[PDB]
Design a protein around this ligand. Sequence first.
Ligand SMILES: Nc1c(NCCCOCCOCCOCCCNC(=O)c2cc(O[C@H]3O[C@H](CO)[C@H](O)[C@H](O)[C@H]3O)cc([N+](=O)[O-])c2)c(=O)c1=O
Ligand SMILES: Nc1c(NCCCOCCOCCOCCCNC(=O)c2cc(O[C@H]3O[C@H](CO)[C@H](O)[C@H](O)[C@H]3O)cc([N+](=O)[O-])c2)c(=O)c1=O
Ligand SMILES: Nc1c(NCCCOCCOCCOCCCNC(=O)c2cc(O[C@H]3O[C@H](CO)[C@H](O)[C@H](O)[C@H]3O)cc([N+](=O)[O-])c2)c(=O)c1=O
Ligand SMILES: Nc1c(NCCCOCCOCCOCCCNC(=O)c2cc(O[C@H]3O[C@H](CO)[C@H](O)[C@H](O)[C@H]3O)cc([N+](=O)[O-])c2)c(=O)c1=O
Ligand SMILES: Nc1c(NCCCOCCOCCOCCCNC(=O)c2cc(O[C@H]3O[C@H](CO)[C@H](O)[C@H](O)[C@H]3O)cc([N+](=O)[O-])c2)c(=O)c1=O
Lengths: 103, 103, 103, 103, 103
Amino acid sequence: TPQNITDLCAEYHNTQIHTLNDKIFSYTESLAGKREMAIITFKNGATFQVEVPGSQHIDSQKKAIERMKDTLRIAYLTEAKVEKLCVWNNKTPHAIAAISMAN
Amino acid sequence: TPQNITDLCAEYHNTQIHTLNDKIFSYTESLAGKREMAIITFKNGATFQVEVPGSQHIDSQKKAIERMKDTLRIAYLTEAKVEKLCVWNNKTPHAIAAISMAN
Amino acid sequence: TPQNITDLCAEYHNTQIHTLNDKIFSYTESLAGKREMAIITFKNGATFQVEVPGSQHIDSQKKAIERMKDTLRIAYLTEAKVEKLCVWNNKTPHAIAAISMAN
Amino acid sequence: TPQNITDLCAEYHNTQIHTLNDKIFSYTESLAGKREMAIITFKNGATFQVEVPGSQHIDSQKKAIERMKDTLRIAYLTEAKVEKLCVWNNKTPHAIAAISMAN
Amino acid sequence: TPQNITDLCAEYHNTQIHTLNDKIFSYTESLAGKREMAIITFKNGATFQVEVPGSQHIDSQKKAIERMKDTLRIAYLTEAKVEKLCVWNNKTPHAIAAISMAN
Ligand SMILES: Nc1c(NCCCOCCOCCOCCCNC(=O)c2cc(O[C@H]3O[C@H](CO)[C@H](O)[C@H](O)[C@H]3O)cc([N+](=O)[O-])c2)c(=O)c1=O
Ligand SMILES: Nc1c(NCCCOCCOCCOCCCNC(=O)c2cc(O[C@H]3O[C@H](CO)[C@H](O)[C@H](O)[C@H]3O)cc([N+](=O)[O-])c2)c(=O)c1=O
Ligand SMILES: Nc1c(NCCCOCCOCCOCCCNC(=O)c2cc(O[C@H]3O[C@H](CO)[C@H](O)[C@H](O)[C@H]3O)cc([N+](=O)[O-])c2)c(=O)c1=O
Ligand SMILES: Nc1c(NCCCOCCOCCOCCCNC(=O)c2cc(O[C@H]3O[C@H](CO)[C@H](O)[C@H](O)[C@H]3O)cc([N+](=O)[O-])c2)c(=O)c1=O
Ligand SMILES: Nc1c(NCCCOCCOCCOCCCNC(=O)c2cc(O[C@H]3O[C@H](CO)[C@H](O)[C@H](O)[C@H]3O)cc([N+](=O)[O-])c2)c(=O)c1=O
């Protein structure tokens, strides 16, 4: 398995690493039907989503989508610095695939 | 997908944005039958609910309703500033559809 | 729907509001069979339970019972002030139906 | 029905109360097969387990076992004072049945 | 049952104990398909994973895998010192079987 988020990200098509080294500036979450998702922003304006679960996802990803929204919420409320995000860049906002947190 | 809570709220009928930019003043939750819900207030007297799950909800919303009560609870306890709420204004108290936190 | 805990509490028989306006003094939780419950006390000696799930509860209350014990544990640990409890008083200790937190 | 941990503990055979009145010294958890358990210790050297779910546990204890591991984790991290533990003493380490937390 | 992480770790083949006595330096988690995992590192560079659930895990480990990612995230955020890790060393990064935390 990959040793880090950069190596993990490179295993997939349509991805890119974003290097933030900053806390989350805003956290949004919705329960509206067909938009059950989260959206975060950083102070520079860069915006990211956790996608609504769909036909593009395999079953194993469902629990991990729920965990990512948990992660983002707590990271936001603790002001944790996000180091990098691995995202799919074939969506807007870019869709989070993975996150790294470091000091 | 929407970039922010205002654009997401605009996708639905019978909704509005409330701009609070304030922490939650009170948090209430109930396990009583047919009243399994949360209610929050702001110091200006605005009151909102997370509805009881029912027939107006699609299955994918169920997990999201539970997550939203989770979110409000921790927002309350951490005194996190709520920026905006997207609500259905066809219910009393207005029913939460999405939340944004910033600052 | 109800706008506050007092109006909610009044929808049910065999309930009363207790006004605490205090943090929880003790939190006790059990996994022993037939006693899978939580008990909280306040420094005025008032004691309350989250009842073991049973045939008195409808299906939709199950998730909310588990949520209540999460709420009471985190309230305890954060020393959050509990404003009011809505309880069933046909049980000893009185059984929690709803909680409000403020101040 | 019990109003406190001592009374609840007394309801079961092969149990005893340990009075700690201290925070947890160490918290251990495992995901290894057939050892999906938690172990806590105190600075006096007392060691306790949350048992692996098995055929001694009825269905309704399974959820409560999960919650107890949650509770011990967060108690540990917050340095909350543990007042008493109700344990089964026919297992080594003694097996937790209930916990009370108080200042 | 085991009294500590060292005795638990010794019940399994292909395991070793790593003694860290330090907080986690970075936390990574992924929802990408077939890489639904967590990776942590320590300041000395040492890197560990929580494996993707697979056919080498029995059903009872599934829930504990979920729990371990929860634990590592909150450990990371609270800067909790990790005492020891029990890992399987037949994988790269070494795969976490158990964790102990102590100050
Ligand atoms: N696959 C796929 C897609 N498509 C995904 C589409 C993303 O769409 C979001 C656009 O929003 C839907 C706007 O809906 C109008 C539809 C008619 N539906 C409703 O009437 C309706 C009403 C609602 O309100 C009731 O329920 C609320 C609780 O949900 C609340 O109680 C309110 O008070 C009630 O009146 C709510 C909804 N809802 O959706 O939440 C809908 C794509 O791209 C793909 O590949
Ligand atoms: N769809 C829809 C609806 N319907 C929702 C409207 C409901 O509003 C709330 C009004 O509530 C019910 C008032 O209670 C009378 C119900 C008769 N049932 C009971 O007797 C009963 C008894 C209860 O107490 C027992 O259980 C408690 C635990 O639940 C506890 O153990 C206690 O000690 C017991 O005596 C409790 C309930 N209960 O509901 O909680 C009910 C609408 O509008 C739509 O559009
Ligand atoms: N509805 C309803 C009721 N009735 C509810 C009754 C309230 O009961 C409270 C006390 O319960 C029974 C005390 O147990 C004696 C009964 C026989 N049970 C056991 O043999 C037994 C043994 C246990 O120990 C084993 O399991 C432990 C884990 O559970 C541990 O591994 C230990 O080492 C083992 O020896 C444990 C239990 N258990 O219940 O936890 C029981 C009412 O009133 C209503 O409305
Ligand atoms: N009832 C009851 C019992 N019995 C309870 C048992 C006490 O058990 C602990 C003793 O442990 C036995 C360990 O099993 C070795 C047997 C062979 N099994 C395995 O081959 C095996 C291999 C494992 O490693 C692979 O999977 C790992 C993930 O789980 C990791 O990916 C690794 O890289 C892989 O090589 C792991 C396990 N596992 O069990 O975790 C087992 C009692 O008492 C009662 O009352
Ligand atoms: N057993 C076992 C294994 N198996 C584990 C393999 C480890 O592999 C990781 C490398 O991953 C596969 C790279 O995939 C390319 C192949 C085709 N797959 C895709 O088409 C694909 C596309 C995806 O993007 C869509 O879905 C995204 C959400 O998942 C997002 O919405 C994006 O916008 C969409 O385009 C995503 C995936 N996905 O897998 O996440 C795949 C081993 O080793 C053993 O021992």
